[model samples]
Target: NAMMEFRFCFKQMNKSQHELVLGWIHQPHINEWLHGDGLSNTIKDLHEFLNDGKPWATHWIAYDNEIPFAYLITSEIEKSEEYPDGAVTLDLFICRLDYIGKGLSVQMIHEFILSQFSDTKIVLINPEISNERAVHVYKKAGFEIIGEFIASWHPVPHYKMKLCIEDLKKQR
Candidate 1:
């Protein structure tokens, strides 16, 4: 049902990775979503991201078979309509051009998602509601679609999805 043994690892990203990450996010389809259809200003964004002094956020690099395949950012959302106490959300992508349409997004994230938040109670994701394919992967990983939210900087709304650690355990 899968290929390549699905080996992967996540390492926290450093400021030095701006260009490396930019190359991936620059993908036409990817840039449209992440860059809000504007020129991607990753250089400026990453500079601030590295120096902004936010300790609650973590950026990650995902490797499949020891080859870089994706970029990820994990952060905690506080005072939200749901999970008022706290919730962790992930922003990530399988950036390698070759990895597109390979079912790797679900494979990679499903493999890493729960482990990334194993100690936490829940993990949330907010993908644009139009991206049904991405949403399919989240559902396969047991993430429940809660609803939608209009982010201050982005157009339209995003589907707010989440996965519970307890349900993750139940799946296995």
Candidate 2:
């Protein structure tokens, strides 16, 4: 028989969870993309940066069977000028390697896009051109490559992908 059904909780991270969040951000999967000190000063900078304002700059930790295994960093498109005129970005998402290849990340992306940005016409993401796995995952989740650009923070080429809400609605 299977184990008892599990419940996952999603809530805005607080200072208490800062250490865990920072640790996750420093994970190899994430740190490699950042291309700097895994636990760099920027981690602290982000902590202070998001704490001051912009409630939209929030993260959610997903616990499966009562164990933390996935994370998502998201924000409203209009909340910051970083994104284009009317599209939100699924900025950073990472799942513990142990839980990878299980399709959880794709499910999380779909749920978040459906529940959080349903009203938005487009969702944007910048996946490193070199990270083929990430690009594949995004494509599997319905994102389409639209353009490419060099990010100011890193020298890597990033492919910008967009998912249309109307397209997603058609899938249902």
Candidate 3:
């Protein structure tokens, strides 16, 4: 298939889509990795997390042939002592249960993350060490596992993965 035909549609998520995001975040598999506010397993909890503040983060919805299946989030580590300067954290998952194990998860991520954020120098990801599947996706997308650390807010320890723009240029 042509590149255009093989790609998904990703759009910035708005406040109106709160219910949809909440619904997905509660999925058994999803909740296992991403629980809103550590225990808020509910809509309000998700809202607070998703709608926190500007520039801290941004969200987007990915659609395959018009069917919404994944959510993407990107954030900065401006004042965090745990991360280095110019770090951009990314988090995303496929909401449609069927999308798992079919290789669509990484495709959606590669298509979106690699193509956008033109001037960004660093994109950081920290998936729990146990989430082998997510770590694999990041590695496949050119993200390197640099170190490990326990997240300040989210539960469990994670492996820090980073993708640098200079390395991306080498691939091209």
| Candidate with best TM-score | 1
lDDT of 2 by residue, 125-150 (tens): 89889988889988988899999998
RMSD of 3: 4.6
What C-alpha lDDT does candidate 2 achieve relative to the native structure?
0.69
Candidate 2 residue-wise lDDT at 142: 89
TM-score of every model? 0.80, 0.77, 0.77
Better of 1 and 3 by TM-score: 1
- Give the Å error, residue 92, model 3: 0.8
Task: Put down candidate 1 lDDT per residue, 42-137, tens digits, no spaces.
Answer: 445455577765344577888766688788777877765767657788877778878755466766776676557666777888888877777887
TM-score of 1: 0.80
What digit string (tens of lDDT, one per residue) describes model 3 on residues 58-164? 66788877788888777766645654446677788788888875367656766676566646678888898998888887787788989999877675789988888
lDDT, model 3, position 40: 54
Clashing pairs in 2: none
Q: Please, what is the whole-model Cα lDDT of each candidate in the order they appear?
A: 0.73, 0.69, 0.73
- Which residue runs of candidate 2 sit more than 4 Å off their true CA positions? 1-9, 37-45, 53-56, 79-85
Relative to the unseen true structure, what is the C-alpha lDDT of residue 127 in candidate 3, on a scale of 0 to 100? 90
Q: In model 1, which range of ten residues has the least summed lDDT? A: 37-46
